Each structure stands twice: as C-alpha cells, then as structure tokens.
C-alpha cells in the first residue's frame, strides 16, 4: 500500500511547497508594510550599491523600484524607479531617477491627471549634507500622470539626474548604500 503512503507523502510535499511560497510572500508583504509612508514623502534605502550597480551594467537588473508610498491613508499610490547605470540619454553615464504613479485602491476618488509637485533627490550622507535634488510639476498631458489602468504608469523623471562620476566620487554613497528621497506635495489637495 506504499502507493497510498506515497500518495499522501506526495500531497503533503506539494502543500509544504505552497506553504513556503506563502510564507516568503508574507516576509515581502511585511517589509513593504513595515516601510509604508502616508505623508507623501519617501525615503528609499538602497543597500549593496557596488554589487547592484554591476548588475545594472551587466544587465541582470537595469532598474530598481521602491516600496510604495502614499499621499495619505487613502490617497495616491506611488513609488520610485532608479537606474544605477542610467537610462535614456544618461545610460552608462548617469544614475537615472524617476517617479511612478501606481494603481491605487482609491483612484476612483482621486483627481486626475495627477498634478502634485514631485521632488526627486539623492541624499548626501556627507557632513555637509548637500543633497542633490530636482522638482517639477507633472505635465497634464503625460500618460504618466493619467488615471492608472495597469499596476503602474510610465515613469517620469530625470535620465540625467547625476553623473555616475560625480556620484561615486562624492559623499552620497556610504557603507555601500545610498538614500533616495522623493517628496510629493500634498498641500494642493483640498481635503482628500
């Protein structure tokens, strides 16, 4: 009857596999949850700069995106996308940094297109704290600030945020880690 024993064993094994995926998926979920921000500001910590940058060049991982952050408990859902080895006109020469609108559970109640002012910036871990950054007001005609249809809209930002040379030779990187900060203006919003 080992067939029966074996069948049962087989079933259990499949279950344990599912369980392992279920579990891992939750570790991820916890992580995202543990780093959520609802005031429209994001502080994204990227560890392993060297290794990651290399994965960029090689092309194993051209970009990285942050956990999601919000303008409020029930507001716009957004995240950041970075390219360690550059994108577009800055590929191979710059670090590209973009803003991303994601499909939020409450999009139906939020104003569109997205018109909140976004401020992209790379923090200087140096004692002078001369953080690099740039702000812009969404272009009302860009399909990037359109009411989401897919999980996330087309990212918008600066392909040439910083020269890779400037970066690596400045005091922005420290302990093989960098910090990206995004600031979305929420004042504009009347009383969402």
């Amino acid at each position: 009857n080992t067939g029966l024993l074996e069948s049962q064993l087989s079933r259990h094994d499949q279950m344990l596999s599912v369980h392992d995926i279920r579990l891992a998926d939750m570790d991820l979920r916890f992580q995202v949850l543990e780093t959520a921000s609802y005031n429209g500001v994001l502080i994204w910590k990227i560890r392993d700069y060297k290794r990651r940058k290399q994965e960029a060049v090689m092309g194993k991982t051209l970009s990285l995106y942050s956990q999601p952050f919000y303008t409020g408990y029930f507001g716009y859902k957004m995240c950041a996308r970075v390219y360690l080895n550059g994108d577009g006109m800055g590929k191979g020469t710059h670090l590209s940094l973009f803003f991303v609108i994601m499909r939020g559970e409450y999009d139906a109640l939020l104003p569109w297109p997205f018109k909140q002012k976004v401020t992209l910036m790379l923090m200087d871990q140096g004692s002078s704290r001369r953080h690099l950054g740039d702000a812009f007001k969404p272009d009302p005609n860009s399909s990037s600030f359109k009411k989401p249809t897919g999980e996330m809209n087309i990212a918008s930002g600066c392909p040439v945020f910083v020269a890779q040379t400037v970066l690596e030779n400045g005091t922005y990187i420290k302990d093989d880690t960098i910090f990206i900060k995004v600031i979305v203006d929420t004042s504009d919003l009347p009383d969402p």
Binding site: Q31, L62, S63, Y65, D87, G88, K137, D139, G157, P159
Partner: peptide
C-alpha cells in the same frame, strides 16, 4: 520642471529593507 519619460527597459527588481 518637465518630467522626462523613462525607457521601460525591464530587468527591474523591488529593493527595500
């Protein structure tokens, strides 16, 4: 002050921790 569309090159990866 004008957003510049990014190339959805792919090879993306969620990284936060």
């Amino acid at each position: 002050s004008v957003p510049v569309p990014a190339t959805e090159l792919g090879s993306t990866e969620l990284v936060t921790t």
